[PDB]
Amino acid sequence: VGDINDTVRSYLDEAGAFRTAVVNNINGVLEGYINNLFGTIERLRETNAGLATQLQERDRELRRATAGALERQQRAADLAA
Amino acid sequence: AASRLVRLIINMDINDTVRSYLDRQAFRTAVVNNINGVLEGYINNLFGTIERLRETNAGLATQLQERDRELRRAT
Amino acid sequence: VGDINDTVRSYLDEAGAFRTAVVNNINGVLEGYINNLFGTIERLRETNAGLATQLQERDRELRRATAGALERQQRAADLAA
Amino acid sequence: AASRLVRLIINMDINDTVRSYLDRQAFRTAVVNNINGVLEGYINNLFGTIERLRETNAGLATQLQERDRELRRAT
Amino acid sequence: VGDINDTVRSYLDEAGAFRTAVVNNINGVLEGYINNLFGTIERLRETNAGLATQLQERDRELRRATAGALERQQRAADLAA
Amino acid sequence: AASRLVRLIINMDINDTVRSYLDRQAFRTAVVNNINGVLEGYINNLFGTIERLRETNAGLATQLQERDRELRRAT
Amino acid sequence: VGDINDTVRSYLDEAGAFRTAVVNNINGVLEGYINNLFGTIERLRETNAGLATQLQERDRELRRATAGALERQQRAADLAA
Amino acid sequence: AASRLVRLIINMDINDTVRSYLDRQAFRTAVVNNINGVLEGYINNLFGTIERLRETNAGLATQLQERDRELRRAT
Amino acid sequence: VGDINDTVRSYLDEAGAFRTAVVNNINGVLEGYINNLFGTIERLRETNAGLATQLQERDRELRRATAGALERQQRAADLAA
Amino acid sequence: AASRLVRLIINMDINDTVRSYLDRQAFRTAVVNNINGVLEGYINNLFGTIERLRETNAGLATQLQERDRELRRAT
């Protein structure tokens, strides 16, 4: 959005020790951002753990299905022989 | 260091706090008046956008209701 | 209601650096109104998208009904002839 | 600044925030006393309006109850 | 409560630029009170409108009932003939 | 100035706002001590009313349960 | 808890103009206690009123039961004779 | 007014307010150091209490599960 | 997490009357933490009481069950004779 | 005061509050610039970390869909 840059250049023109206050505000913004991303990374870890458990569950289901199909085919072949 | 703030916001609450922070005395008052004027113009553009959106919404709603009424007639 | 206008003209008569503070406060107020305008635009965009979806669905079932009616009429005419 | 506020409020919370922020010594004290008197008069007018609302609501409720009894007699 | 008036009188006697602050703060109190007065006005207006709608619909059913009674008595009179 | 405040409190939150607003050094400390003492007297009276209400509630509840037991006996 | 008492004693040692601030703060907390006391008084009054009405209902029920029992016994005695 | 505060706290949120307001230069620094030390001591005592409570909770939980297993095998 | 220690060390170097304010803020934060400590000890006490009640109920149930089992064995012995 | 702070931190909003409060003029500006730089470096490190984590999550989800499709086709 160009409104952001327009406001930034308007502030720069108005300014032309405030730089110290700007730095402090930037540090506070960085702190807020780091808190938000801590939350996001924690929730994504939880989601990844859930997806991994789902993955192993469906892998077990696939193994069971393949084993059952192989057993049925083997017993059918034995009956045929 | 204003460029760092722009890159941080474009790399994405924070915007509103920055704006609230942003908000010779004769020159300062003149600059504040200029800022008020440009913000007022931007807000007028926003009003025009909202009016256009409302007009399109009304037109599409009348079209939808007319088509629904015609379909009910067709039954 | 003209009460707000009356109190504003009363405060202006009071006025005649305070005006700079008034301008700054109204600037903050219009910034909050800018936030409100952004929210309103988002809501209107969502409503417009939903309305477009509804109109396209209406055209779809209308076309279905017309096609069915034409098929019935054509088969009836062919049977009659 | 009066015209700008007038147009901003006619183009549509604005009143709430503006009048919230709204709130040589002899002159200012005297005119503030005058403003206080104006506010007292406005509040008295509003209380009179409240009393009128109370009276019309009471009359409307009584007539509705009487008509309820009228219908109950009619059956 | 007379205790409230006694405390107010004591504090005002102790106070007597203080009066200007007194008047400013009571103006703020007046604004806070007029907010709730506006809210109550709106609520009472809504209640009045609802009760008016109710009276109108009920007068309509009253007219229906009177018409039905007139029809019944006319039928009875015709049968008596 | 007291007339305006009593009119405002009797017009019907107002009490809370006025008390919040109410919230040479020796004279001021002495007079605020007197006001605090009046407040303590009021608070003690209201604590007495609380105690009396609690006692009456307990007695009435005991009577109620005794009468319920009496009715169950009377069956 | 004795911890609060010993910390108050330690700050009394600290003090030994703070008395005026202590007076103001106890005034404020006593205003808060007054609000809480008003709430408790209202709750107690409502509970007392409800219990009194329910007690009157109980009295009426017991009177009806005793009247019914007396009527039954008198009717039985009369029928016996 | 220490006696009044003691009476008020015994007669019973108030603690939070009084210790929120609670929190020459060299003497003040030394007494504040003493305050920090006594707060640290109380904190350590409370942490020991918390650890003991957690250990007892774990012991009761394992006793509950062991007794439930004994009941299940006793059937 | 080393950034917290790094910032604390940097601000200690910046300080080197700052120590008094730092200690005062530490005490304030300690009180704010004491609030949560009181909450947690209350919760732990409630959980401990609940677990004790469940333990006594369960061992009562177990002793009743073993008494019933002994009664059944005794009845079997009686019917055997 | 570093030892007290680290001991309080390791024993578990606490860090949030302590670093919110924690947040000649030439030396102060140099120190705050260094702090800003180290914050930016840490932010870059964690941003790389979250990018790798998002890539891993996306790959795991894609493989999840592929495995589900294979399982439903094998039937």
Residue numbers in the entry:
A (entry chain T), C (entry chain V), E (entry chain N), G (entry chain P), I (entry chain R): 50 to 65, 105 to 169
B (entry chain U), D (entry chain M), F (entry chain O), H (entry chain Q), J (entry chain S): 33 to 44, 52 to 62, 103 to 154
Please give sentences taken from the publication describing this entry.
The resultant atomic structures reveal not only the expected A-, B-, and C-capsids but also capsids with portal vertices similar to C-capsids but no resolvable genome in the capsid lumen, which we named D-capsids. We refer to these capsids as “D-capsids” because their C-capsid-like portal suggests they were originally C-capsids, but the absence of most of the genome indicates that they are degraded. Ten of the 12 monomers from the basket are linked to the turret helices, each of which consists of one long helix extending toward the portal cap and connecting to two smaller helices arranged in a small helical bundle. The two non-contributing portal monomers are presumably disordered or flexible beginning at their turret sequences. In C-capsids, D-capsids, and virions, the turret helices are fully extended, whereas in A- and B-capsids, they are retracted and positioned ~65 Å lower.
